[PDB]
């Protein structure tokens, strides 16, 4: 589990804006396949419906689901049937997907280990992608503490994200 090869950004936003901000990223980034992380199961459910309101296909997985159910979803996502996946935290989430070049923390985690489980990759060589963290004013404390505890750096999103970082 490594961060090397992952370009990490953040963006400041209000809670009531996160859905409008997420749509902007949908229109700004060259997403092959996406994964979007929320902090609660119901938050995963509602976000999935909001993304569908916007017109994109949406899968989703959370802990309260059934393992037999998460398998069908993950397998279909793998094969590429739907492009975006919203999900909560899972001890046994699964292998990494090669077509996922954009991970989004729709909600910023509180512990550094969770960030590593969300943004980490298997092996430093090969995989290339970007991570975008949506942080509220309140989340700032956890942002500096998380990078210091990890030894990584999370920079403000730039005007243009070079495709060579995730395409």
């Amino acid at each position: 589990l490594t961060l090397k090869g992952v370009t990490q950004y953040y963006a400041f936003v209000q809670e009531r804006q996160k859905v409008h901000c997420l749509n902007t990223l949908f229109s700004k980034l060259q997403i092959n396949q996406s994964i979007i992380f929320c902090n609660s199961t119901q938050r995963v459910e509602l976000l999935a419906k909001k993304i569908t309101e916007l017109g994109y296909c949406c899968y989703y997985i959370h802990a309260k689901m059934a393992q037999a159910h998460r398998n069908r979803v993950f397998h279909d996502f793998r094969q590429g049937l739907c492009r975006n996946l919203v999900c909560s935290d899972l001890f046994t989430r699964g292998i990494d997907v090669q077509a996922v070049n954009v991970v989004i923390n729709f909600d910023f985690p509180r512990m550094a280990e969770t960030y590593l489980h969300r943004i980490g990759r298997s092996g430093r060589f090969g995989h290339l992608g970007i991570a975008i963290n949506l942080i509220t004013y309140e989340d700032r404390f956890d942002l500096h503490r998380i990078e210091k505890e990890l030894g990584t750096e999370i920079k403000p999103i730039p005007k243009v994200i070079d495709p060579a970082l995730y395409v």
Partner: peptide, 27 residues
């Protein structure tokens, strides 16, 4: 506690959107 999210309330489909030098979103 599971509250009603603030973003589930307001209209999700609005045009525009960008980020400024400080990384703050402009809706």
């Amino acid at each position: 506690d599971e509250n009603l999210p603030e973003w589930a309330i307001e209209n999700p489909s609005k045009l525009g959107g960008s980020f400024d030098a400080s990384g703050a979103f402009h809706g």
